[PDB]
């Protein structure tokens, strides 16, 4: 028998808090978008076996959304968007393990569509981080 370092643990309690914050913010504002799909490992059972899959997919969605909120759609025509953008980044930064390099008008309508879709995604993320924080630790 041996015992071997497995690397840095995900920061579950911080991610739990940032993802909860993001849910609050996304609802404070009343295609090929990534979605946490069923294959993605984010379900309760999928988290025990291997959470890297899920977290990696969550990271991907976070960076997709942060690019959208920083883009022309939100800084052009006529707010929780500033704090939302920054928190999207904060969380994605927490997910990025050392060594891994996981980084790669009509507006009022688009902005409604994007924010609605963001609410959905961040709720899944919040459940993942809350479950991980509670059962993996």
């Amino acid at each position: 028998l041996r015992a071997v370092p497995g690397g840095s643990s995900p920061a579950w309690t911080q991610c739990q808090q940032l993802s909860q914050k993001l849910c609050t913010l996304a609802w404070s504002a009343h295609n090929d978008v990534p979605h946490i799909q069923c294959g993605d490992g984010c379900d309760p059972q999928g988290l025990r076996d291997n959470s890297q899959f899920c977290l990696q997919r969550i990271h991907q969605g976070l960076i997709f959304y942060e690019k959208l909120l920083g883009s022309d759609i939100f800084t052009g025509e006529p707010s929780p968007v500033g704090q939302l953008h920054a928190s999207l980044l904060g969380l994605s930064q927490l997910l990025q393990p050392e060594g891994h390099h996981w980084e790669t008008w009509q507006r009022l309508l688009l902005r409604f569509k994007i924010l609605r879709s963001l609410q959905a995604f961040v709720a899944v993320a919040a459940r993942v981080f809350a479950h991980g924080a509670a059962t993996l630790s």
Partner: protein, 300 residues
């Protein structure tokens, strides 16, 4: 504008204006023969025509019904014709009563107690008789994925019908990208109507009320510890499918004090007072779906 609804049932699309010319329909008997054939409508022995085909005019709901062909005393085939009336570009919706709540033109209301893939839809009608409802559902429209529904049955009374459906391949924890479609066929005598509903399960979530709501008075103080549990219908594990709560303390009167607290815990300490009740309701923690009904308990 004429299509098969089910075996031997055909819907005729009827564009109507007061001087309706009437659309002509040709009905063919479902038989290998063409001799000795007569036609009757519904329960009458009156011969309306002879031979393998019958040509009829449809202008109004009485122009329809179960046309039947006969040879040697024997029924060869039945063809029931229903009419879907398009007033002036718009189809009729007399059968179901607008609920007027989520938006206007909302005839079907669906809700789910959890993320399992089971949901319930209901609808309202004034009509008490000669009523059949048929329910279909799927996830997506491009390549529909299976959802199994039961029979629509009278559930309460205005007339209320409900149906239970279950997504065949549920993924409770996923972020849904394609909505569930609900299609209800509504038949009143010979009047056919369509009803449709589109949604994400996440948006029709309404949990059941908090369970086992109970009070625990503090020693020689007015304060009470309120405690409760997640409903049994709620998705498990709770560590993942979190709920959040609203605790309310209110009197019977108008101008009396009110106390309202938000908490992710399943306990709270409130101040009780004679003739006040403690109410607790629930909502998904991370997504702003519908609050449960109140569970409540008198300060007694």
């Amino acid at each position: 504008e004429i299509w098969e609804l089910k075996k031997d049932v055909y819907v005729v699309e009827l564009d109507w204006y007061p001087d309706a010319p009437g659309e002509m329909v040709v009905l063919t008997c479902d038989t290998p023969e063409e001799d000795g054939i007569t036609w009757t409508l519904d329960q009458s022995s009156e011969v309306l025509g002879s031979g393998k085909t019958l040509t009829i005019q449809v202008k109004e709901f009485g122009d329809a019904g179960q046309y039947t062909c006969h040879k040697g005393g024997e029924v060869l085939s039945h063809s029931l014709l229903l009419l879907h009336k398009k007033e002036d570009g718009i189809w009729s919706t007399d059968i179901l009563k607008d609920q007027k709540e989520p938006k206007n033109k909302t005839f079907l209301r669906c809700e789910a107690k959890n993320y399992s893939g089971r949901f319930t839809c209901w609808w309202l009608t004034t009509i008490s008789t000669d009523l059949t409802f048929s329910v279909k559902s799927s996830r997506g429209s491009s390549d529909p994925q299976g959802v199994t529904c039961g029979a629509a049955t009278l559930s309460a009374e205005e007339y209320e019908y409900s149906v239970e459906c279950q997504e065949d391949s549920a993924c409770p924890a996923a972020e849904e990208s394609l909505p569930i479609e609900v299609m209800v066929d509504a038949v009143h005598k010979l009047k056919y109507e369509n009803y449709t509903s589109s949604f994400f399960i996440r948006d029709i979530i309404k949990p059941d009320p908090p369970k086992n709501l109970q009070l625990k008075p503090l020693k020689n103080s007015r304060q009470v510890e309120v405690s409760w549990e997640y409903p049994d219908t709620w998705s498990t594990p709770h560590s993942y499918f979190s709920l959040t709560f609203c605790v309310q303390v209110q009197g019977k009167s108008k101008r009396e004090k009110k106390d309202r607290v938000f908490t992710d815990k399943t306990s709270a300490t409130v101040i009780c007072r004679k003739n006040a009740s403690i109410s607790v309701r629930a909502q998904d923690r991370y997504y702003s779906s519908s609050w449960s009904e109140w569970a409540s308990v008198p300060c007694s």
